Amino acid sequence: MILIADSGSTKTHWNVLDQGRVIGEIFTKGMNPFFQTPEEMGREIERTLLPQLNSNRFCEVHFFGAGCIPEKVPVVRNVLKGCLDVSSLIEVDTDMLAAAKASCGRSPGIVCIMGTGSNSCFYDGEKIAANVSPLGFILGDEGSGAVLGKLLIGDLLKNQMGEELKEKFLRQYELTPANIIERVYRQPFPNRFLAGISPFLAENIEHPAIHSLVLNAFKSFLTRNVMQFDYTRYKAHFIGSVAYYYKDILEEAAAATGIRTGTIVRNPMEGLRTYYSTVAKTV
Amino acid sequence: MILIADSGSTKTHWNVLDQGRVIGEIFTKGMNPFFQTPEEMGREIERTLLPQLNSNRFCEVHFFGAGCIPEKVPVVRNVLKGCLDVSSLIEVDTDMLAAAKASCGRSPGIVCIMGTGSNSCFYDGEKIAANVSPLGFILGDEGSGAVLGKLLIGDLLKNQMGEELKEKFLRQYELTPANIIERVYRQPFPNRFLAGISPFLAENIEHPAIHSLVLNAFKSFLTRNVMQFDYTRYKAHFIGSVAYYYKDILEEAAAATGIRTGTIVRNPMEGLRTYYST
Numbered sequence: 219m220i221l222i223a224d225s226g227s228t229k230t231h232w233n234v235l236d237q238g239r240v241i242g243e244i245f246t247k248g249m250n251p252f253f254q255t256p257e258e259m260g261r262e263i264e265r266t267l268l269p270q271l272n273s274n275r276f277c278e279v280h281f282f283g284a285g286c287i288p289e290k291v292p293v294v295r296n297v298l299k300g301c302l303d304v305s306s307l308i309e310v311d312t313d314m315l316a317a318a319k320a321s322c323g324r325s326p327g328i329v330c331i332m333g334t335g336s337n338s339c340f341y342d343g344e345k346i347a348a349n350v351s352p353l354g355f356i357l358g359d360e361g362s363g364a365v366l367g368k369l370l371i372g373d374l375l376k377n378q379m380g381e382e383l384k385e386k387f388l389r390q391y392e393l394t395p396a397n398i399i400e401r402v403y404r405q406p407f408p409n410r411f412l413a414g415i416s417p418f419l420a421e422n423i424e425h426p427a428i429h430s431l432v433l434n435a436f437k438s439f440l441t442r443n444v445m446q447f448d449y450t451r452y453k454a455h456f457i458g459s460v461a462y463y464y465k466d467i468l469e470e471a472a473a474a475t476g477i478r479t480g481t482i483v484r485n486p487m488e489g490l491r492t493y494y495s496t497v498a499k500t501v
Numbered sequence: 502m503i504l505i506a507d508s509g510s511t512k513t514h515w516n517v518l519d520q521g522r523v524i525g526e527i528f529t530k531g532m533n534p535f536f537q538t539p540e541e542m543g544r545e546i547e548r549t550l551l552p553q554l555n556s557n558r559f560c561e562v563h564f565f566g567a568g569c570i571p572e573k574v575p576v577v578r579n580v581l582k583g584c585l586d587v588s589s590l591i592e593v594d595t596d597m598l599a600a601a602k603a604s605c606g607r608s609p610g611i612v613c614i615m616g617t618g619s620n621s622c623f624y625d626g627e628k629i630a631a632n633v634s635p636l637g638f639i640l641g642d643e644g645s646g647a648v649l650g651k652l653l654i655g656d657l658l659k660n661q662m663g664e665e666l667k668e669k670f671l672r673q674y675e676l677t678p679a680n681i682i683e684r685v686y687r688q689p690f691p692n693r694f695l696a697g698i699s700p701f702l703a704e705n706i707e708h709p710a711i712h713s714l715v716l717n718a719f720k721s722f723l724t725r726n727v728m729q730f731d732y733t734r735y736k737a738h739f740i741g742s743v744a745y746y747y748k749d750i751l752e753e754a755a756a757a758t759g760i761r762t763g764t765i766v767r768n769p770m771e772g773l774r775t776y777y778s779t
């Protein structure tokens with residue numbers, strides 16, 4: 219009856235709300251209109267989503283994703299209307315707004331995403347009222363998986379972390395220094411590659427130098443992004459796998475910088491379902 | 502007459518030496534064999550160097566450049582041989598070895614380059630004996646023009662430096678944030694773009710936040726790169742426009758970190774002239 223989606227770098231999460239039930243665990247590839255053509259997006263829904271659905275008939279669709287800024291929402295709406303039989307309404311907005319709806323519902327707060335990339339905004343309870351452009355894995359995106367990966371690879375290859383952790387990393391991911399350079403400078407989606415090797419931090423978090431890398435990265439995200447908003451007045455909510463799997467260090471960073479922490483959740487899907495059952499039910 | 506050259510990402514510096522005199526000072530574009538075919542290098546030499554010479558006869562050529570690793574030495578040497586009339590010797594090596602010969606001559610030393618990129622090595626008096634791979638403008642290249650540019654843009658756009666400096670930057674270079682994202686992530690030579698806007702720091706160095714940016718970047722270069730070497734035994738030499746035009750801050754970084762600076766020079770040409778005169 220209702221279809222909801224949150225689209226990230228790696229995957230899109232789809233949920234169906236129908237007759238008081240939730241059907242989750244429906245995944246496709248990411249669906250970012252800055253990186254995919256309308257025919258690529260259409261091909262992807264047709265081939266990978268529709269087979270997982272009993273029907274393509276829906277009352278409403280609420281699609282959220284990276285790249286679904288104003289300029290791109292008509293494109294995405296178009297793709298969806300061509301694949302799905304939607305009787306009422308198709309909403310398209312950003313992953314950030316999904317994170318806000320999930321974590322804050324209908325009330326105000328500071329909302330942050332910490333996954334492959336990172337992002338932060340002020341949500342007024344209805345819409346994003348302010349935001350800090352992340353700037354990508356090179357210039358910004360502090361605390362993201364990609365930046366964590368960027369920091370780690372720099373530390374290991376420059377021998378900042380000793381021989382053992384370096385060789386353990388290269389052996390684990392079957393990388394040479396030459397391969398890493400190739401992938402970072404000369405292949406598509408280097409941010410994805412870097413994020414993909416960042417779990418090495420969580421696995422080795424016991425090492426003081428690893429713990430420190432993560433702590434400093436997070437402090438950097440908070441001071442450069444979150445502290446731009448009225449943080450002494452509003453809780454900051456965090457959504458994403460980086461936020462979640464390094465939750466202890468994120469709280470440590472917040473205590474050290476002076477930020478009131480709120481929700482820390484792995485993904486916004488549970489919160490979005492709450493949104494569409496409770497608050498958004500009425501409209 | 503002998504011809505000496507030091508080639509980086511921006512320029513190739515050439516000197517003609519004859520009878521104890523420097524007979525010409527000539528610039529062409531950079532010639533990196535990883536970024537140019539042998540053909541393209543030949544054309545650039547013929548079109549831009551040769552018109553600036555009054556003969557193409559040299560006893561020796563000594564060409565130093567980024568990318569001129571052993572793998573590429575035959576390719577570069579062949580282009581030079583096909584463009585010039587050299588009687589005795591064509592030597593081809595790295596910009597790093599040029600910095601070493603210039604700053605150290607025949608004595609050991611720690612040698613660093615701080616230009617568009619950065620690099621650090623130990624020179625044993627004859628050849629480079631050890632080095633720290635720079636890792637490029639994303640992963641490494643601490644203290645480089647590219648990285649200074651990267652730090653600046655982040656700081657300005659994320660409002661860490663005030664509104665005035667941000668507006669001044671965007672106005673000066675006729676840039677929007679959209680343009681910047683485009684140039685950094687989706688256009689060729691993003692490191693060159695970043696390095697190309699880095700002079701804004703030198704132009705605004707009296708601003709505390711600007712000075713702070715540069716000091717911290719230099720500290721990071723020293724701790725991550727130079728300190729890998731036997732720096733209490735050898736003084737560290739610095740070659741490059743970034744090392745030169747931020748000399749005072751580099752010395753401050755060095756004193757803060759316990760590194761003993763030697764030579765700080767804009768480029769190795771002076772030193773290379775001394776080298777070939779002994």
Ligand SMILES: Nc1ncnc2c1ncn2[C@@H]1O[C@H](COP(=O)(O)OP(=O)(O)CP(=O)(O)O)[C@@H](O)[C@H]1O
Binds near residue numbers: 225457458
């Ligand atoms: N168990 C785990 N331990 C450590 N890191 C993990 C992890 N599971 C995932 N990650 C890391 O989290 C990052 C991606 O998390 P997430 O799935 O939230 O990103 P995403 O790309 O879908 C959101 P966006 O694109 O909006 O930033 C990657 O860096 C990944 O390696």
Ligand SMILES: Nc1ncnc2c1ncn2[C@@H]1O[C@H](COP(=O)(O)OP(=O)(O)CP(=O)(O)O)[C@@H](O)[C@H]1O
Binds near residue numbers: 509696699746
């Ligand atoms: N007067 C000046 N003040 C500050 N920065 C300067 C400068 N002149 C050049 N730069 C910057 O220095 C960087 C390059 O340094 P340099 O001039 O040594 O060239 P390079 O590193 O490409 C070696 P080569 O000269 O052989 O090409 C660029 O970011 C450039 O804009």
Ligand SMILES: [Mg+2]
Binds near residue numbers: 742
């Ligand atoms: Mg120059």
